[PDB]
């Protein structure tokens, strides 16, 4: 099928240059009419067109940004590169590359997008803590449990349950930057009360920006008391 994939550093420092790479397949940039463009989206803002390059090497740029942008391709390597100079905090956004077919349609296929944060703060991997099920017994309908993923930078982190096998009822809350300057979030899942103590639940946390992965088992708590 036709696929596009963006890659680059997850964090860049103010004034530095960002180099993004769009690797694609399912098509060739040599095919007449083919084009690959770049679009970005700041957290909570609208899409903004950045630039594009045609099969014949014609390059087009957003006027507001032209000065800082350089687009190029390597058909041999099936990749288009966008270099953005003098990065500013306002450039923090998710960057997408997309395929277009001139005289036919714009952006019919997009990459998944890669998050870029412009900050002076350093990379930090997350710590993961269990949100143990308040339940313990079977007959009780449904129990909620989850994982607290805190003190990491920058975005993003991904959370799965039982290596992807558990997806129904999962809610992974949007990260929120704490006053400490580090992000934190919880991923919760509701399961059968009867499964507590018998079914193993594990949250798998991946923080690509720091190449950190953490699996955390979540189980009912053993109470400290006079037994």
């Amino acid at each position: 099928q036709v696929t596009l994939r963006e890659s680059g550093p997850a964090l860049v420092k103010p004034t530095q240059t960002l180099t993004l790479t769009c690797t694609f397949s399912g098509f060739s940039l040599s095919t007449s009419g083919m084009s690959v463009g770049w679009i970005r989206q700041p957290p909570g803002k609208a899409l903004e067109w950045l630039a594009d390059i045609w099969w014949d090497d014609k390059k087009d740029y957003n006027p507001s940004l032209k000065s800082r942008l350089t687009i190029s391709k390597d058909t041999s390597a099936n990749q288009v590169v966008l270099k953005v100079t003098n990065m500013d905090p306002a450039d923090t956004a998710t960057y997408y590359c997309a395929r277009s077919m001139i005289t036919n349609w714009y952006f019919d296929v997009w990459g998944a997008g890669t998050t870029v944060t412009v900050s002076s703060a350093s990379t930090k991997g997350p710590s993961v803590f269990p949100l143990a099920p308040s339940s313990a017994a079977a007959a009780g309908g449904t129990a909620a449990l989850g994982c607290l993923v805190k003190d990491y930078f920058p975005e993003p982190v991904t959370v799965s349950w039982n290596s992807g096998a558990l997806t129904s009822g999962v809610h992974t809350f949007p990260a929120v930057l704490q006053s400490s300057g580090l992000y934190s979030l919880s991923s919760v899942v509701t399961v059968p009360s009867s499964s507590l103590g018998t079914q193993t639940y594990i949250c798998n946390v991946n923080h690509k920006p720091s190449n950190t992965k953490v699996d955390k088992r979540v189980e009912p708590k053993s109470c400290d008391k006079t037994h």
């Binding site: 679009i39 067109w49 957003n62 006027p63 349609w105 997009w110 934190s184 919760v188 400290d224």
Partner: protein
């Protein structure tokens, strides 16, 4: 360019019309559908051509400086931010967006409270989490009470994007305390006020009950 409305809440079955007005005459318009934090999906190209794999429910029209996107009878999975794109002339531009929310019946939140793990406490900090699960409308007030004393400025909330199936929301309120302060108190309660609740629900635990 100018897109409107910026936001809209409409019931299932409703007919919805989004408009993009450019100051400059436009040849043709493209429309995209973007699910939260996911990549945009092409809906309409050449002003009115339905893209492949797009419900006949959506349609585009317009000319000159004004173009429109229409969803004949909205439905749960239509929750998304819609964008028009003008690539027929310079400068190429996207619309500011129209975030579409789907209206549904009131649904009360299922509330859960989670005490800090012994593991986190070791690190010197205590996070107390309160979950309000699968509710609607989105407005909900959650107050933390430590030993009956109302907390202020020591918690953050995070709300989930509307569910594409049940048009519901989930929210987490997180209370952060130093291990020192956490051990200075007994009862931690999360009180939830919501339209679907005849009276505030309170979930709590006593430090040390387990």
């Amino acid at each position: 360019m100018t897109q409107s409305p910026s936001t809209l809440s409409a019931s299932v079955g409703d007919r919805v019309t989004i408009t993009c007005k450019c100051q400059l005459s436009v040849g043709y318009m493209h429309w995209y559908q973007q699910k939260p934090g996911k990549a945009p999906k092409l809906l309409i190209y050449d002003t009115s051509k339905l893209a492949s794999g797009v419900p006949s429910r959506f349609s585009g029209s317009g000319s000159g400086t004004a173009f429109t996107l229409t969803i004949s009878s909205l439905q749960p999975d239509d929750f998304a931010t819609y964008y028009c794109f003008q690539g027929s002339g310079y400068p190429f531009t996207f619309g500011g967006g129209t975030k579409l929310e789907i209206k549904r019946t009131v649904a009360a939140p299922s509330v859960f409270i989670f005490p800090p793990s012994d593991e986190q406490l070791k690190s010197g900090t205590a996070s107390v989490v309160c979950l309000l699960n699968n509710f609607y409308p989105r407005e909900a007030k959650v107050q933390w009470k430590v030993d009956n004393a109302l907390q202020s400025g020591n918690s953050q909330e995070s709300v989930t994007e509307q569910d594409s199936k049940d048009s519901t929301y989930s929210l987490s309120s997180t209370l952060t305390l130093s291990k020192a302060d956490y051990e200075k108190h007994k009862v931690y309660a999360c009180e939830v006020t919501h339209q679907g609740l005849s009276s505030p629900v309170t979930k709590s635990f006593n430090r040390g009950e387990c």
